[PDB]
Amino acid sequence: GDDIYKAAVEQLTEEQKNEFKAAFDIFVLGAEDGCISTKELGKVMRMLGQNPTPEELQEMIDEVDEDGSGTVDFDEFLVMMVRCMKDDSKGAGAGVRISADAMMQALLGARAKESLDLRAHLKQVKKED
Numbered sequence: 001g002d003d004i005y006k007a008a009v010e011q012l013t014e015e016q017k018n019e020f021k022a023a024f025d026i027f028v029l030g031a032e033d034g035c036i037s038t039k040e041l042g043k044v045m046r047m048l049g050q051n052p053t054p055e056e057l058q059e060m061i062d063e064v065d066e067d068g069s070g071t072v073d074f075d076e077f078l079v080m081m082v083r084c085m086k087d088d089s090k091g092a093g094a095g096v097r098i099s100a101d102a103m104m105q106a107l108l109g110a111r112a113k114e115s116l117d118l119r120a121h122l123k124q125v126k127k128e129d
């Protein structure tokens with residue numbers, strides 16, 4: 001049931017559909033496997049205010065793993081974003097729940113993410129950034 005997940009390509013903004021390349025690219029920047037692992041996780045988690053455990057990262061990855069060895073494909077990420085907007089809470093059983101925009105703004109956060117107002121999904125008191 002990956003209708004909006006796989007079709008997210010058209011659901012993504014004008015800059016998002018193009019940021020999905022550099023975004024995930026930074027996650028595996030210099031990766032010999034080409035994919036993301038529990039190691040790279042903590043590397044990005046800090047960029048989005050998050051300091052989980054080395055054993056917990058296996059959970060947020062297991063639900064998005066293809067090989068089943070603490071990892072995730074490049075496509076499993078694209079959906080993780082479009083699915084996050086509606087499912088801000090996918091972890092279930094942790095201290096908090098990571099969002100999608102939080103990952104994008106952390107990964108690149110320079111190109112453009114206001115063309116469609118993706119960060120507007122969290123209309124609430126924020127910082128000056």
Ligand SMILES: Cc1cc2c(cc1F)OC[C@@H](NS(=O)(=O)c1cc(C(=O)N3CC(C)(C#N)C3)c(C)[nH]1)[C@H]2O
Binds near residue numbers: 080090095
């Ligand atoms: C490989 C990859 C996958 C994911 C990533 C980034 C990635 F690099 O971020 C979003 C995450 N979905 S989630 O619902 O936010 C989510 C939160 C949690 C959780 O147990 N914790 C919140 C926590 C970080 C704290 N304190 C610990 C889980 C299992 N899922 C998951 O899709």
